[PDB]
Design a protein around this ligand. Structure first.
Ligand SMILES: Cc1cc(C)cc(-c2onc3ccc(-c4nnn[nH]4)cc23)c1
Length: 238
């Protein structure tokens, strides 16, 4: 992810088949002639898509030009959460399944994994960050406190941002409960709130290298969303 001052990010296409698949996803959803109500509704929860982009001198180097979801914030607090019970897709080899499950064997049970967070603290005027090892260390016993960490500024627990997050996830959950044409693997929710304000949050779906046609509800994604909502709800009782 490369931030541009014009309020966009450039995401470099991952190696094949992942990068081409994510390009195809965005191209399908943002098709100029799309009249599918499911895909039109989905646009509200994605970064705005500005099409494929490559440097003027390097047609080989493929990027997606996407809305920077953090752009409108002064001191954005950012958390990336992978959603689902399986981080591998329906066409993974035995090797690949074992690789993905070993990366976080609690994915089936918890339904989400914190990929990282960047939290602005008022009283130090600085950012703590957690890398992928943080979320991969979280268990059933520590997931609530693990998630809570995102909402701790230098002073209080930002229950305002917690409640707003629930309300926005609920809309995304509503979309998932009203569609049976896409299943999403190893995709994420990007949380942003203002660290410098009240109840102002972004929650956007990102990372679509493993999105596939389906005939069913995305049950794994629904489970992950519902557990995440339940965890956030319990934090409101702190
Ligand atoms: C400052 C900052 C940090 C982070 C972690 C993410 C972002 C970010 O803002 N808008 C985004 C749209 C898409 C993605 C994306 N798609 N696939 N992978 N990342 C990331 C985005 C911005």
């Amino acid at each position: 992810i490369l931030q541009h001052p014009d309020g966009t990010v450039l995401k470099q296409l991952q190696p094949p088949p992942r990068g081409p698949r994510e390009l195809e996803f965005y191209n399908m959803v943002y098709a100029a002639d799309c009249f599918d109500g499911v895909l039109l509704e989905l646009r509200k929860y994605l970064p705005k898509y500005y099409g494929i982009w490559s440097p003027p001198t390097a047609p080989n180097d493929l990027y997606l030009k996407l809305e920077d979801v953090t752009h409108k914030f002064n001191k954005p607090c950012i958390m990336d959460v992978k959603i689902g019970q399986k981080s591998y897709d329906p066409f993974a080899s035995s090797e690949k399944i074992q690789q993905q499950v070993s990366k976080y064997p609690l994915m089936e049970e918890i339904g989400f994994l914190v990929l990282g967070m960047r939290v602005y603290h008022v009283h130090s005027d600085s950012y703590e960050t957690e890398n992928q090892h943080y979320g991969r260390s979280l268990t059933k016993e520590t997931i609530k406190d693990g998630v809570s960490r995102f909402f701790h500024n230098g002073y209080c627990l930002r229950k305002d941002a917690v409640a707003a997050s629930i309300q926005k996830i609920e809309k995304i959950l509503q979309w998932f409960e009203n569609q049976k044409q896409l299943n999403f693997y190893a995709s994420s929710l990007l949380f942003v709130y203002e660290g410098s304000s009240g109840g102002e949050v972004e929650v956007r779906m990102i990372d679509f290298a493993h999105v596939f046609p389906s005939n069913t509800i995305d049950e794994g994604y629904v489970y992950g969303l519902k557990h995440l909502i339940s965890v956030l709800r319990s934090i409101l009782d702190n």
